[PDB]
């Protein structure tokens, strides 16, 4: 049974700085500077900041565009899943990714989603019904405060998820932390559907916040250290100084 849970507030913005870099492929490299072209969140971009405070719970339907950078900071594990699709109703196949205490369930079905879907661990009040599914996958859960970052890409039918989890110190401004951390590949799902919109699923029973950015086709120079770990990167289309650094292959 769908339950209609509000006012609409204007968005906040935060400074992305140097974040959103992920390993472009599954190839070991070390002690080398590698130039690659792929979809990355632009350096020093403007990222949309949403709030979950409890009396406001931001969970709007957002565009997916060409890929989404998603991040959240919390302790109570309020953000537990995502919905990806087009019309997000019984007319088309949609992707539902939901985490719980023991596992993660990923399935693609013609879901009739609720006007304001959520989880309620007294159970799913995400959809009222579902028809014939095309994809099923079950594995281990994907999910000082916990900083969780994800990259969602949809290329040639493959829904690629990258992720990173680090502990962060609490700062009063409650902004994005500075520093460099690369995202490792998590899962690659052979689904084959058209994602144009997505929505964040919140679990009810605290405070949390999340950020949304969009990826662009850009050229990056990635620095691999002795242990094949990416420790730095240059956005070759940010400014004239970065352009020179990329040309000369030097940080």
């Amino acid at each position, epitope marked *: 049974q769908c339950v209609n849970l509000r006012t609409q507030l204007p968005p906040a913005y935060t400074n992305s700085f140097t974040r959103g870099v992920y390993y472009p492929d599954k190839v070991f490299r070390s002690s080398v500077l590698h130039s690659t072209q792929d979809l990355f969140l632009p350096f020093f971009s403007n990222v949309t900041w949403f709030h979950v405070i409890s009396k406001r719970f931001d969970n709007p339907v957002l565009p997916f565009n060409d890929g989404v950078y998603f991040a959240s900071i919390e302790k109570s594990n309020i953000i537990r899943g995502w919905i990806f699709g087009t019309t997000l109703d019984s007319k088309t196949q949609s992707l539902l990714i939901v985490n719980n205490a023991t596992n993660v369930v990923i399935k693609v079905c013609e879901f009739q989603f609720c006007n304001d879907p959520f989880l309620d661990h007294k159970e799913f009040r995400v959809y009222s019904s579902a028809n014939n599914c095309t994809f099923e996958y079950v594995s281990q859960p994907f999910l000082f405060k916990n900083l969780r970052e994800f990259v969602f890409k949809n290329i040639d039918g493959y829904f690629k998820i990258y992720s990173k989890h680090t502990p962060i110190i609490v700062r009063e401004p409650e902004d994005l932390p500075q520093g460099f951390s690369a995202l490792e590949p998590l899962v690659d799902l052979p689904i084959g559907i058209n994602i*144009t919109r997505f929505q964040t699923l919140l679990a009810l029973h605290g405070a949390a916040a999340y950020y949304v950015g969009y990826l662009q086709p850009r050229t990056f120079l990635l620095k691999y250290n002795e242990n094949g770990t990416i420790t730095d990167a240059v956005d070759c289309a940010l400014d004239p100084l970065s352009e020179t650094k990329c040309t000369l292959k030097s940080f």
Partner: antibody
Amino acid sequence: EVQLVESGGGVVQPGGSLRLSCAASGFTFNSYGMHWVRQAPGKGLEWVAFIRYDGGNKYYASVKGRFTISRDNSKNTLYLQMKSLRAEDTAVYYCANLKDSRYSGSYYDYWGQGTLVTVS
Amino acid sequence: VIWMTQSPSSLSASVGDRVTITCQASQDIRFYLNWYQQKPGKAPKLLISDASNMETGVPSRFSGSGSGTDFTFTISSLQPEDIATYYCQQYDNLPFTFGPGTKV
């Protein structure tokens, strides 16, 4: 509140040019695509142009080759540059964010007030 | 380019009457049709999306249905506040197009 404000209208001569602009606020302008739609007195709605969120791909209607669509995401401003204007282009020009599950992905439908452009 | 047409171009109805407007597309656009209502001097307002989905805040007296090329917009009981020009718009592919408009 979400508000789209057109400006730059007025009266021009045939063969001349005019640059219109739309100021956006109250929403994440830089993540959405935008459309231009015009309506001449006595007529229905006519679609003119569309630009993607990244200011990359551009599409045009009757106007292709004469009108140029562009945007600046640092100013939250949408622009339409009209060259070689004709008498038939007299209309009220609106900027809009049209609900679209296939291309822009917008889940919300927004319209401005419109600005009048007269060619004579 | 997809052609859009509507019928009748104008209709006369009283308060309490049932009003139906037909939209037809020259090409199959599945379920990607928007319905707009425009009052004189105002920008168009969206009432129905994806053929049959109602927008939030739209009165229950409004409805619509259809798929492919033939779509219908219905007012179950016309109100004095429902006097406007109704337009259908397709967004299956670019360029997007609007119909002629129906005068109620």
